[PDB]
Amino acid sequence: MQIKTKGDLVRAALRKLGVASDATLTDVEPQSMQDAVDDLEAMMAEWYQDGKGIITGYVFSDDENPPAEGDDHGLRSSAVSAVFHNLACRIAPDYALEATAKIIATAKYGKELLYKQTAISRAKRAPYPSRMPTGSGNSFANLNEWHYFPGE
Amino acid sequence: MQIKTKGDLVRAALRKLGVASDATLTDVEPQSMQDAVDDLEAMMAEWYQDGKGIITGYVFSDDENPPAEGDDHGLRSSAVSAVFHNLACRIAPDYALEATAKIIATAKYGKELLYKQTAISRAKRAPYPSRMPTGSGNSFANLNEWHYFPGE
Amino acid sequence: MQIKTKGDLVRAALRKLGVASDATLTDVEPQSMQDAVDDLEAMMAEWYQDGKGIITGYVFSDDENPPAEGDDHGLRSSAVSAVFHNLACRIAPDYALEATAKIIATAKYGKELLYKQTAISRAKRAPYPSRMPTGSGNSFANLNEWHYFPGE
Amino acid sequence: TTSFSIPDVGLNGIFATQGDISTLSGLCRIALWYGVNATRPEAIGVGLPGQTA
Amino acid sequence: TLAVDEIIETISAITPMAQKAKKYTPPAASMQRSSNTIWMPVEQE
């Protein structure tokens, strides 16, 4: 993938928004790039609710390494489009812009696809209640089989 | 098919958008191809969710090969229209454009046709539960001494 | 029929769109003609899902013979109208156009009429289950000892 | 497993069936162990007609 | 298809030599240790 850093995500988002791209004649300043990377970090921390939200493999930059930009985002190949579309939607108000309908729809679809597999994994059925019996079918086999279910 | 590379897919999408075609005397700007190829790769990675999404035979370029443009996409002949229509819809916001209603409808129809066969294949019925008897009429089960189904 | 080639289908679609015909003083370039032929090929490949889609007798040109335009389409005389109406609908966005209501309605009607006979053919009822008895009324089946239907 | 008594020849073998549940299949096998011995080769003979040149 | 309940019999073999051959069953427990072989004496001269 050609997108491998937080700045690559930011540049893709700006290209989607039409603010700045490679073919452009006027570009945005590095302070604005850093602000966009900061907004990306804020959105990622909001999504990954300390491990109880959307899992993507995003790696949060530490203060010791000076530029947050330049770090590999760590996302899988299937998450990049959703990430930078949502970032473009979030940073559109910065440049007096509003993201278009196609961008909004793609961002919604990308976030849903991001959480689909985690939802499948988290959809688990609880164990048996602590007061249920194991049944007499589970008594002749495993002669020391429990009479009641543990629970918890 | 005469659309055999990511470049042909990108050029078809641009022409559908009316950005760089022959019906209008506009040549493909070199930067209008790299960004479109990036968008196509991102969309394909998003669709083919590491094997659990839409299977299309698309071949993802690796970091070793320098030019992403120029590779055979590997798609079947029945997927090209959907691919380039969706690509045009995705890359329309770059030029402050908006894909027309016909292009959007064709994209929807093509995506549905793309997933139709995969849906047919994945519409599989689960095996019998572990607690069913096989019945007394199951000659094979009686021969193999299986009074109950194995499940799993 | 007067329309016997892919180029003829493309020219008919263009005339229906009102862009280029045999009476106009301006014409479309051969590159546009060839690429419209490419679009028609992509459409037909999408429709005919490798044998599981809309069967029309369309013949896909091979790369060994260079000019795809100039190849007999192979369609029956009743499929030409639907084919070129849908082609006009799909290649209208190339010229910053939108197919008119009459063209849209004719394309829909033609596609439905194209698939009518295939749908009638494919509306087949499943054989008897392997768990149903043939019944005693079938004396020959009872004597040949075919007490239960074969199935499959 | 059960026995498997061949008629004509007065021999006995085994007949066994097994079932694999992972693949929902089965196997069948009819085994027979024996050995033909010639205790007196000086008594057995062979007639060879038309052994000219 | 309703395969008729008749069978076209094709082959009919006969085994006279195996029927006339005398059949011997030595003790299995001893043969296992003796490696499936057993010795028999020969008429003395």
Swiss-Prot record, chains A, B, C:
Keyword terms of this UniProt record: Degradation of host cell envelope components during virus entry, Degradation of host peptidoglycans during virus entry, Hydrolase, Late protein, Lyase, Viral genome ejection through host cell envelope, Viral penetration into host cytoplasm, Viral short tail ejection system, Virion, Virus entry into host cell
Superkingdom as given in the UniProt entry: Viruses
Record localization: Virion
Main location: virion
Keyword Hydrolase assigned: yes
Alphabetized InterPro entries for the sequence: Gp4_sf (IPR038258), Tail_accessory_Gp4 (IPR020362)
GO biological process: symbiont entry into host cell via disruption of host cell envelope; symbiont entry into host cell via disruption of host cell wall peptidoglycan; symbiont genome ejection through host cell envelope, short tail mechanism
Annotated Gene Ontology cellular component terms: virus tail
Disulfide bonds: none
Gene Ontology molecular-function annotations: hydrolase activity
Entry comment, domain topic: The N-terminus changes its conformation when transitioning from the preassembly state to the postassembly state.
Protein task: Tail protein that binds the portal ring and functions as a head completion protein. 12 copies of gp4 form a structural ring at the bottom of the portal ring. Together with gp10 and gp26, gp4 is required for stabilization of the condensed DNA within the capsid; perhaps by plugging the hole through which the DNA enters. Plays a role in ejection of the bacteriophage DNA into the host cell at the initiation of infection. Functions as an exolysin that catalyzes the cleavage of the glycosidic bonds between N-acetylmuramic acid and N-acetylglucosamine residues in peptidoglycans.
Subunit structure: Monomer; homododecamer upon binding to the portal ring. Interacts (via C-terminus) with the portal protein; this interaction participates in the head completion. Interacts with the Tail hub protein gp10. Interacts with the tail needle protein gp26.
Name of the protein this chain belongs to: Head-to-tail adapter protein gp4
Gene name as annotated: 4
Swiss-Prot record, chain D:
Subcellular location: Virion
Effect of D8A: No effect on phage growth
Disulphide bonds in the chain: none
Superkingdom, taxonomy of origin: Viruses
Domain notes: The insertion domain (I domain) plays an important role in the folding of the capsid protein by acting as an intramolecular chaperone.
Subunit structure, interactors included: Interacts (via N-terminus) with the capsid assembly scaffolding protein (via C-terminus); capsid proteins and scaffolding proteins form building blocks that assemble to form the procapsid. Interacts with the portal protein.
Function: Self-assembles to form an icosahedral capsid with a T=7 symmetry.
Family recorded in the similarity comment: Belongs to the P22 phage major capsid protein family.
Name of protein: Major capsid protein
Originating organism: Salmonella phage P22
Lineage of origin: Viruses, Duplodnaviria, Heunggongvirae, Uroviricota, Caudoviricetes
From-to range in the entire protein, with total length: 378 to 430 of 430
